[PDB]
Design a protein around this ligand. Structure first.
Ligand SMILES: CCCCO[C@H]1O[C@H](CO)[C@@H](O)[C@H](O)[C@@H]1O
Length: 158
């Protein structure tokens, strides 16, 4: 089991960490959503589906910078929504194919009432999402840490 990002940066068997750069809507008003869909950014595959079943959860999701201070939101994982920052580990998603499959996680963020101006700075860390991978084969328990960075400023009209 290993993963790779849209631009090809990968985290090998055993886990590790990688940065994911995302382009964000430049203008987001209070009452509107800023959707950060990682399903088009992070992909993983099972290296031995003939024998092993891989289990993948969103172990933890944390907010940073402009997202931590100016937005409120939830994280959608494999069809279900949870609080973000996360309060617990999500249920497992099975990976049983050698073909790359998307990691079904998306952040649904919305400006807080007092949000205004540059709510998110270009190049800043907005979130850290931890993908935890285990299996039905051995004691492997690995973390694939995804550091989500904003490619541009996000402005909230005042
Ligand atoms: C006998 C071969 C083991 C290959 O081990 C690697 O691939 C499998 C299947 O994806 C993972 O469950 C495991 O944690 C490693 O990432």
């Amino acid at each position: 089991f290993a993963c790779k990002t849209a631009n090809g940066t990968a985290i090998p068997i055993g886990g590790g960490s990688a940065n994911v750069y995302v382009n964000l809507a430049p203008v987001v008003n209070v009452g509107q959503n800023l959707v950060v869909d990682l399903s088009t950014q992070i992909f993983c595959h099972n290296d031995y589906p003939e024998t092993i079943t891989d289990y993948v959860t969103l172990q933890r999701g944390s907010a940073y910078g402009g997202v931590l201070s100016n937005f409120s939101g939830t994280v959608k994982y494999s069809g279900s929504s949870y609080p973000f920052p996360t309060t617990s580990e999500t249920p497992r998603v099975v990976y049983n194919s050698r073909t790359d499959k998307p990691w079904p996680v998306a952040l649904y963020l919305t400006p807080v009432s007092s949000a205004g101006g540059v709510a998110i700075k270009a190049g800043s860390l907005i979130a850290v999402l931890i993908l935890r991978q285990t299996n039905n084969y051995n004691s492997d328990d690995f973390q694939f840490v995804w550091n989500i960075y904003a490619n541009n400023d996000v402005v909230v009209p005042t």
